[PDB]
Amino acid sequence: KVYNDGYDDDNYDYIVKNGEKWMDRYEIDSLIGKGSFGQVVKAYDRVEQEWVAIKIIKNKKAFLNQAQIEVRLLELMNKHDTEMKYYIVHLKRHFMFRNHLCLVFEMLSYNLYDLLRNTNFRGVSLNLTRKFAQQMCTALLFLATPELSIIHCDLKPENILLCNPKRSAIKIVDFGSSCQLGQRIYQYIQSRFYRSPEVLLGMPYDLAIDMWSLGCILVEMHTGEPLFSGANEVDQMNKIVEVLGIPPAHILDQAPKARKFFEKLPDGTWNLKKTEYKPPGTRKLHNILGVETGGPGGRRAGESGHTVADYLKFKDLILRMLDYDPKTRIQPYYALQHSFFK
Ligand SMILES: COc1cc(N2CCN(C)CC2)ccc1Nc1nc(N)c(C(=O)c2ccccc2)s1
């Protein structure tokens, strides 16, 4: 009949009314997004005299409890970053309002998908992609700090926010799917497009899955299209193999879900099960990026900082981020020292 004295709906979400005053402090403007966790809203903080995003968690135990884990990690990240210089959206404060847990963040304006949509999915330049890459590798180095050891677990374009148009800077948002390095409790994780092979294979995993996600994102930021746009896990694996070839046998012999995508011949090699696809590793990244052919779809022909030399450095890096072996895949510190960033 009514939910939470009328303040809530079916899904335990707070019904947001335009121009409502909570606590003589926050002035609600408009809803900016919806998710499984609850809602996000654009508000004006009267005390600090600034705009904020407020994450209104659902009035439901499971969602409260999940968001309390998120709070715990965000405040652990504040302890290790008082200067706010590692390109992370930071928790300002949290509070209870009409039985909802609300997390207050600084308000950014657009996500990286918006940026892409504004290019009509043709991409931004390599000079913009460089800057964003350095900042993301900085963010991951920080996450990999031994006391934090945090896996974001859902790096995709909507979880990367643009600071502001003349500042040319990005930040990582939404640590609600995040956890610290540990014994494996979860298996169906990451967004499919950016899901790593260790995850698709049901193998152990660590902070290197986030670097796989970043390999994909950076190719997408310069091409405008996702690198591996799988319709399901089988099709995702197949798209990965098209570019990078069959994974190594030492890996596939260990992998508990190997037989979902591959099969073991009598000689002991692994090959693709049949489900349309190019043969293993013949869709080269060299050619997707258009290293010698004037960038993606010829659009970077004649533009400064888009030479063969420049493109090879970017390629080289991406290839190190898309290593099949999580042990040898490039870590954040070695990524920062790459010649792509000179
Ligand atoms: C003006 O507010 C935003 C609007 C958008 N969009 C742009 C308008 N739409 C085309 C798609 C969503 C994307 C992001 C924001 N701003 C946000 N700033 C922060 N700080 C956000 C979050 O903290 C956040 C909270 C929960 C999940 C994801 C992000 S969301």
Residues constituting the chain: 342
- C-alpha span between 62 and 333 (Å, rounded): 36
Query: 20, 9 in Cβ contact below 8 A?
Result: no
**Are 67 and 132 part of one and the same domain?**
no
Report the distance separating Cα 221 and Cα 151, nearest Å.
Answer: 22
Token output for 221: 């930021």
Q: 127 and 94 in one domain?
A: no
* Whether residue 97 is found in the same domain as residue 134: no
Instruction: Report the C-alpha gap between 29 and 113 in whole angstroms.
Output: 23
* 96 and 191 inside one domain: no
Whether residue 45 contacts residue 23, with contact meaning beta carbons closer than 8 Å, is answered with: no
What radius of gyration do the chain's Cα atoms show? 22
**Domain housing 69:** 1-81+89-107
- C-alpha to C-alpha distance for 303 and 130, rounded to whole angstroms: 15
* Structural method: X-ray
Give the whole-angstrom CA distance, residue 146 versus residue 25.
37
Provide the domain count of the chain: 2
Is the C-alpha dihedral spanning 136, 329, 150, 11 positive or negative? positive
φ and ψ at residue 171, rounded to 5 degrees? -140, 150
- The answer to whether residues 68 and 216 belong to one domain is no
Assess whether 102 and 128 both reside in one domain: no
On whether 106 is known to bind a ligand per the annotation, the reply is yes
How far is the C-alpha of 233 from the C-alpha of 335, rounded, in Å?
A: 28
Ligand 1: atom nearest CA of 117 is 10
What is the Cα–Cα distance from 128 to 163, expressed in whole angstroms? 13
295 is an annotated ligand-binding site residue: no
> Which of 173, 174, 175, 178 gets mutated to test ligand 1 (max ligand atoms within 8 A of its CB)?
173
Three-state secondary structure string covering 65-83: HHHHHHHHHHHHHHHCCCC
Q: What is the resolution of this structure in A?
A: 2.3
Q: Which residues are catalytic?
A: 154
Q: Are 263 and 283 in contact (CB under 8 A)?
A: no
Together in a domain, 227 and 337? yes
Name 263's bridge partners.
Answer: 271
- C-alpha 48/C-alpha 38 separation (Å) is 25
Of 228, 216, 227, 223, the residue nearest 124 (C-alpha) = 223
Distance 292 CA to ligand 1 centre (A): 37
CA of 237 to the centre of ligand 1 (A): 30
65-71, long-range: CB < 8 A, 24+ apart: 66/37, 66/176, 67/37, 67/101, 67/103, 67/176, 68/101, 69/179, 70/103, 70/175, 70/176, 70/178, 71/101, 71/103
- Give the per-residue SS3 of the chain: CCECCCCECCCCCECCCCCCEECCCEEEEEEEEEECCEEEEEEEECCCCEEEEEEEECCCHHHHHHHHHHHHHHHHHHHCCCCCCCCECCEEEEEEECCEEEEEEECCCEEHHHHHHHCCCCCCCHHHHHHHHHHHHHHHHHHCCCCCCEECCCCCHHHEEECCCCCCCEEECCCCCCEECCCCCCCCCCCHHHCCHHHHCCCCCCCHHHHHHHHHHHHHHHHCCCCCCCCCHHHHHHHHHHHHCCCCHHHHHHCCCHHHHEEECCCCCEEECCCCCCCCCCCCHHHHHCCCCCCHHHCCCCCCCCCHHHHHHHHHHHHHHCCCCCCCCCCHHHHHCCHHHC
Please measure the distance between the N-terminal and C-terminal CA atoms of the chain and give it in whole angstroms.
63
Amino acid at 276: E
| CB 128, CB 170: distance < 8 Å | no
Tokens 């014994």 -> residue: 183
- Of 107, 142, 172, the residue at which a domain comes to its end is 107
240 and 212 share a domain? yes
The answer on 182 and 154 residing in a single domain is yes
Q: Are 34 and 161 found together in one domain?
A: no
The annotation status of 108 as a binding-site residue, yes or no, is yes
What is the distance of C-alpha 204 from the center of its chain?
A: 20
- Quick one: 231 exposed, middle or buried, by C-beta within 10 A (0-12, 13-18, 19+)? exposed
Question: Tokens representing 135?
Answer: 């900042």
CB-CB contact of 300 with 290 (8 Å): yes
Residue 55 beta carbon below 6 angstroms from any ligand 1 atom? yes
> Which residue's structure tokens are 């890996």?
251
Whether residue 110 has its Cβ less than 6 Å from ligand 1: yes
CB burial string 79-114: b at 16+ within 10 A, e below? eebeeeebbbbebbebeeeeebbbbbbbbbeebbee
Contact between 324 and 197 under an 8 Å Cβ cutoff? The reply is yes
Cα angle value 141/147/149 (rounded, 5°):
50
| Statement to judge: residues 120 and 73 lie in one domain | no
Q: How far is CA 181 from the centre of its chain?
A: 17
Please name the residues in contact with 187: beta carbons below 8 A apart, sequence gap of 6 or more. 199, 202
In this structure, what CATH number is given to the domain that contains residue 198? 1.10.510.10
Q: Whole-angstrom Cα distance, residue 24 to residue 28?
A: 11
Phi-psi region of 49 (alpha: psi -120 to 50; beta: other; left: phi over 0): left
Residue 284 CB partners (closer than 8 Å, separation 6+): 243
Distance CA 71, CA 273 (A): 44
Tracing tokens 């939910």 back to the chain, one arrives at 3
Residues 202 and 293 in one domain: yes
Residue nearest to atom 20 of ligand 1 (CA): 107
> Which residues contact residue 155 at a Cβ distance below 8 angstroms, ignoring those fewer than 6 apart?
172, 190, 191, 194, 210, 213, 214, 217
